[PDB]
């Protein structure tokens, strides 16, 4: 950000960027600001891009220091309002700089370091990569079984698929909390519950998808939707099944179609669905040729199902480096 | 405590108090300890009573400092283990001094400042007076009605007594949480829920009994028991009905008996029940004579009911200063 500030040394801007830079110069904090090396003096309105990018630098400094304390210790005293919390609270001032440069005839300048920086922000965001969480279905089933046994309503393991679907739907659409503080948990059960709490505690733009290993039925997805909602995950991440064994690839389109049949899920999925297609285990239990061919069929009929339900399907290919995977 | 340390200057003690004073002198913190005025030097084991009482001074000093921060601000950094948390963590060292003094033939010394201090501790405790909470029945009914309506299960107001009893019993014996964070509350609903949260946050020995105004049915008491359990009140306070108007004094024995009939409640009541008897309003709607006489009869038949259920009834007389109340 400091090198970008050094380059944006123009003095022409729109009335818009002028007004905003005047706003920042109002709350300019006439102070020493000696913790910085460069630009430690209050930036004059003569160079407005430097004013705005100066505020971006301040919020960057406090974002870095906060994350540094949050990591080093367990907490930070840095105010959240002093940092960049949004994916595009960051982008807004830089977008404004770009509009300014273009309006004033400086599109060549804008398509330089400022464009490089814009693309880096809009490509990497505040956390370089969005993290996926993957977990096998049987662990979610163990959790739910603990929940139904503790609630004295049956054993979710012993329940048929129909029963699991009806129950999970009633809880997802219901408004009463499920388990409580006094739910008996195993180290495994507490592992998955605690990963959901960690997911809830952290910013939403830090995570990607929740991938279900050995996913076979809609109850496996709905279980994760419910456990997320119940662990107070403010912005729940999308659920995506992983079909890697040949048997699961053969029956995948049917399962996805049955999931889209559930009106509640199709209404909450918002017309977009991602499903993962594993490549490692397919060519291990069956032939490599049969595996590849079945993979082709799988993609084809999954697209057929998604088109049949008006859902934009994006498929997640778990490809390896070796042809065998 | 300092004047008490000054008197307890004996040098004979039992082996018990000897061992304990040696323990305290082991972790004696060989420091300046200049924050005290008197006894700032580590107390020698020659005067063991002063050793022990000196530690009581340390825990009183930190108990006071913690309570002072907790009051002044919202929190305290004073470790809880540095203070007296129990009503008789305080009493134990003093009891030890008393047993020691008696064993060594100094019961007369023990029956002086130390016995006064024992009585003051055992009578005033860590909070000079135990605090009662009083609230009218209708406010608890408003809360529960909000909960059943939000759970889309009916209207607790419109429900008959029978139905309220069945529901309240199933929830009191059930293990699943009731309402959640998203329950729509009025300022009144939030008032009673928040008084329950405050009660849960504060020490148990700081509160007394929860008095229900305009109490008429077993559902009124069970309602408060449920709200306490559901607001995570660790040690729930005893529920006590208030019969003050002449009609309610007339119907009190029946209502208390109907309450004792709920075996779940009589088994949790632990053989003890307190019921309040108001004196102000009776002689206002009826005569003073009829009120006095009705009060007498009510006391008489409440005792009969409690004896019939093997419950030690203690009655709380809401007497005034003026003969009319």
From Swiss-Prot, chains A, B:
Per its record, what triggers expression of this gene product? Upon inorganic phosphate (Pi) deprivation.
Compartment annotation: Cytoplasm
The entry's note on the tissues where this protein occurs is: Expressed in all plant organs, with higher levels in roots.
Q: Catalytic positions?
A: 284
Please report the PTM annotation for this entry: Enhanced activity by phosphorylation at pH 7.3 by lowering Km and sensitivity to inhibition by L-malate and L-aspartate, while enhancing activation by glucose 6-phosphate.
| Job of this protein | Through the carboxylation of phosphoenolpyruvate (PEP) it forms oxaloacetate, a four-carbon dicarboxylic acid source for the tricarboxylic acid cycle. Contributes probably to the adaptation to inorganic phosphate (Pi) deprivation.
Q: Its quaternary structure? A: Homotetramer.
User: Which family does the record assign?
Assistant: Belongs to the PEPCase type 1 family.
Instruction: Kindly provide the name given to this protein in its UniProt entry.
Output: Phosphoenolpyruvate carboxylase 1
Q: Which organism is it from?
A: Arabidopsis thaliana (Mouse-ear cress)
Q: Which gene encodes it?
A: PPC1
């Amino acid at each position: 950000i400091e090198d970008l500030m050094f380059e944006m040394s123009m003095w022409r801007c729109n009335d818009e960027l002028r007004a905003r830079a005047d706003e920042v110069h109002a709350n300019s904090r006439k102070d020493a600001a000696k913790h910085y090396i460069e630009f430690w003096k209050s930036i004059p309105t003569t160079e407005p891009y430097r004013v705005i990018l100066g505020d971006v630098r301040d919020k960057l400094y406090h974002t870095r220091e906060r994350a540094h304390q949050l990591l080093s210790n367990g907490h930070s005293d840095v105010p959240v309002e002093a940092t960049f919390i949004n994916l595009e609270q960051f982008l807004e001032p830089l977008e404004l700089c770009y509009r300014s440069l273009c309006s004033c005839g400086d599109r060549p300048i804008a398509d330089g370091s400022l464009l490089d920086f814009l693309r880096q922000v809009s490509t990497f965001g505040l956390s370089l990569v969005r993290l996926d969480i993957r977990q096998e279905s049987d662990r979610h089933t163990d959790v739910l079984d603990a929940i139904t046994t503790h609630l004295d309503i049956g054993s979710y393991r012993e329940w048929s698929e129909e029963r699991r679907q009806e129950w999970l739907l009633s809880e997802l659409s219901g408004k009463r909390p499920l388990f409580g503080s006094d739910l008996p948990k195993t180290e495994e059960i507490a592992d998955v519950l605690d990963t959901f709490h960690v997911i809830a505690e952290l910013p939403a733009d830090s995570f990607g998808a929740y991938i279900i290993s050995m996913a076979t039925a809609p109850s496996d997805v709905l279980a994760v939707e419910l456990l997320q909602r119940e662990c107070r995950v403010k912005q729940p991440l999308r659920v995506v099944p992983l079909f890697e064994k040949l048997a699961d690839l053969e029956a995948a389109p049917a399962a996805v179609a049955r999931l889209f049949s559930v009106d509640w899920y199709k209404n909450r999925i918002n017309g977009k669905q991602e499903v993962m297609i594993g490549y490692s285990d397919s060519g291990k239990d069956a032939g490599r040729l049969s595996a590849a061919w079945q993979l082709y069929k799988a993609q084809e009929e999954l697209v057929k199902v998604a088109k049949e339900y008006g859902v934009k399907l994006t498929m997640f290919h778990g490809r390896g480096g070796t042809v065998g995977r």
